Amino acid sequence: PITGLVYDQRMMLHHNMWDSHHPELPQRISRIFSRHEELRLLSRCHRIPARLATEEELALCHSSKHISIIKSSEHMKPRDLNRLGDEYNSIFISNESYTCALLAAGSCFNSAQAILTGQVRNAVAIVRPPGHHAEKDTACGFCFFNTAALTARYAQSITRESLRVLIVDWDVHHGNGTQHIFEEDDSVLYISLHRYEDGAFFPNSEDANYDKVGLGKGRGYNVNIPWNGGKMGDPEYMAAFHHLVMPIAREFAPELVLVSAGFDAARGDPLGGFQVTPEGYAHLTHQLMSLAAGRVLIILEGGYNLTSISESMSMCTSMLLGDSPPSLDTPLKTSATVSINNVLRAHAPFWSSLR
Ligand SMILES: O=C(NO)c1ccc(CN(Cc2cccnc2)S(=O)(=O)c2cc(F)c(F)c(F)c2F)cc1
Ligand SMILES: [K+]
Ligand SMILES: [K+]
Ligand SMILES: [K+]
Ligand SMILES: [Zn+2]
């Protein structure tokens, strides 16, 4: 039983020309990689090569205009990179950004292919820039192309069009691009846990509330678990997994699980304000490994405390490799119970496991 790992230092080339201390740092991925070496997890994994996504693959989720504009940034002068970046919500661009975005997606395509051909049981993708804020038509929030959404469509393209893909997004932010891309789709179940604060937390949209359940044939296939008024941590994420994430996922019966694995809900993150521990992330991984015959791909999204994300993602890989889950600790916060109950009332009509 093999675990795959994809990492390519070329993804470090994407950088902020004017602010070498911008939190979406090149060393985010090299630090996670280094911690895998230190814990001697790297030699336990099979290395899956990176590759470039093709423009035809990008078109599975993105418009030709959006592809064309990001592609043109490779040849832009600094003044134009600044002006283009400023046209988006929270985006910086360098001449290498397009290439790195292509490498992040292609890395995940190769990992999903390795899983779906039975070459590996599961895999981890240490990639940047992130993806889940990227929309069909636009970049957003450090994301150029929606790597997890593209990977789900790539998976369907090499298997069957209706392959059931579950995307669990535990990044502290709502994946607005992933929700929108699949909102009318019953073949891709999107479940997000996120800090919400009644729409005030980035990305600042009420699209992230629990009452957005999907559209058309996708009604019931979009599950938003929004947190309000609390520094959430392990007890709250475990409760959400017990009452919502796992009963829904088991009923959906996915054939592949992608994790939009941002680590900005971790203790110590400068932006998320939450306190999920590396042991917490290990237990979330271990639970998801019970789905889809173990076919799980963990895709790095956000997370900006270099030490926290390195320890947190390494613990997820340890679980993928079959290691025993570590001990967990602290009472559950009642505001989390309020959120969980709101999602139960919104989704029990669609999911008999919640009744
Ligand atoms: O992908 C992400 N996470 O993983 C992610 C995506 C976007 C950002 C951008 N931020 C907003 C933010 C703030 C608080 C909590 N969350 C996110 S920002 O950096 O703070 C920022 C603040 C500004 F006031 C501003 F003008 C910016 F241009 C800007 F970028 C962060 C992370
Ligand atoms: K999320
Ligand atoms: K929406
Ligand atoms: K959906
Ligand atoms: Zn995030």
CA of 54 to the centre of ligand 4 (A): 24
Decide if 3 contacts 121 (C-beta within 8 A): yes
> CA of 214: how far to CAs of 191, 229, 243, 261, 346, in Å?
11, 25, 20, 22, 11
Q: What are phi and psi of 249, to 5 degrees?
A: -60, -40
Provide the residue type at 339 as one letter.
Answer: S
Residues within a 6 A CB radius of ligand 1? 90, 130, 133, 141-142, 171, 173, 202, 262, 264, 271, 302
Residue 289 Cα to ligand 1 middle (Å)? 31
| Protein residues near ligand 2, an ion, with CB under 5 A | 169, 171, 192, 194
How far is 160 from 157, CA to CA, in rounded Å?
6
Q: Residues, the chain, total?
A: 355
Which atom of ligand 1 is the closest one to the Cα of 301? Answer: 4
Query: Mind giving me the DSSP string for 135-201?
Result: -SS--BTTBSS-HHHHHHHHHHHHS-TT--EEEEE-SSS--HHHHHHHTT-SSEEEEEEEE-GGGTS
Burial status of residue 21 (CB atoms within 10 A of its CB: 0-12, 13-18, 19 or more)? exposed
Tell me the helix, strand and coil percentages in the chain, rounded to 5. 45, 15, 40
Which residue, among 122, 346, 167, 132, has the nearest Cα to 243 in the 3D structure? 346
Q: How close is the Cα of 213 to the center of ligand 3, in Å?
A: 9
Which residue minimizes the CA distance to atom 11 of ligand 1? 202
Q: Tell me the C-alpha distance between 241 and 249, whole Å.
A: 10
Ligand nearest to the CA of 85: 1
Distance CA 352, CA 259 (A): 24
Phi and psi based region of residue 23 (left: phi greater than 0; alpha: psi -120 to 50; beta: remaining): alpha
Residue 26 CA, ligand 1 centroid: distance in Å:
17
Residues 44, 29: Cα–Cα separation, whole Å: 18
Residue nearest to atom 31 of ligand 1 (CA): 141
Which of 191, 63, 212 lies closest to 139 in space, CA to CA? Answer: 63
Please state, in angstroms and rounded to a whole number, the distance separating the CA atoms of residues 139 and 88. 6
Residue with the nearest Cα to atom 26 of ligand 1? Answer: 90
- Residue to mutate (ligand 1; options 90, 193, 313; most atoms within 8 A of CB): 90
- In angstroms, what is the span from residue 67 Cα to ligand 4's centroid? 23
Q: How far is CA 197 from the centre of its chain?
A: 20
Q: Which residues contact 123 (CB under 8 A, 6 or more apart)?
A: 3, 4, 5, 6, 48, 111, 114, 115, 296, 297, 298, 320
Strand 188-195 and strand 296-300: pairing? unpaired
Residue 254 DSSP SS3: coil
Q: Are strands 256-261 and 122-126 parallel, antiparallel or unpaired?
A: unpaired
Q: Is 75 helix (H, G, I), strand (E, B) or coil?
A: helix
Residues in Cβ contact with 8 at an 8 Å cutoff, skipping those fewer than 6 apart: 49, 50, 103, 107
Q: Do 88 and 139 form a contact (C-beta atoms < 8 A)? A: yes
3-state secondary structure of 256: strand
Return the residue matching tokens 């789709």: 185
Minimum CA distance residue for ligand 1 atom 4: 302
Q: How far is CA 102 from CA 141, 166, 234, 248, in A?
A: 17, 23, 34, 32
> 71, exposed or middle or buried, with CB in 10 Å at 0-12, 13-18, 19+?
middle
Annotated resolution, angstroms:
1.8
Nearest Cα neighbor of 8 from 139, 115, 156, 107 is 107
Helix (H) or strand (E) holding 275: none
Cβ atoms of 129 and 91 within 8 Å: the answer is: no
Helix (H, G, I), strand (E, B) or coil at 302: coil
Residue nearest to atom 10 of ligand 1 (CA): 90
Residue 3 in 3-state DSSP? strand
Say how far apart CA 241 and CA 264 lie, in whole Å.
18
Two structure tokens written together for 3: 């675990």
State the closest ligand 1 atom to the C-alpha of 304, by its place in the atom list counted from 1: 4
- Residue 313 neighbours by CB under 8 Å, 6+ apart: 32, 35, 124, 126, 261, 263, 281, 298, 300, 303
Which segments are annotated as binding site for Zn(2+)? Answer: 171, 173, 264
Q: How many CB atoms lie within 10 A of CB 348?
A: 12
Residues 6+ apart with CB under 8 A from 64: none
Token pair for residue 152?
A: 């789900």
Residues 6+ apart with CB under 8 A from 12: 26, 27, 29, 30, 128
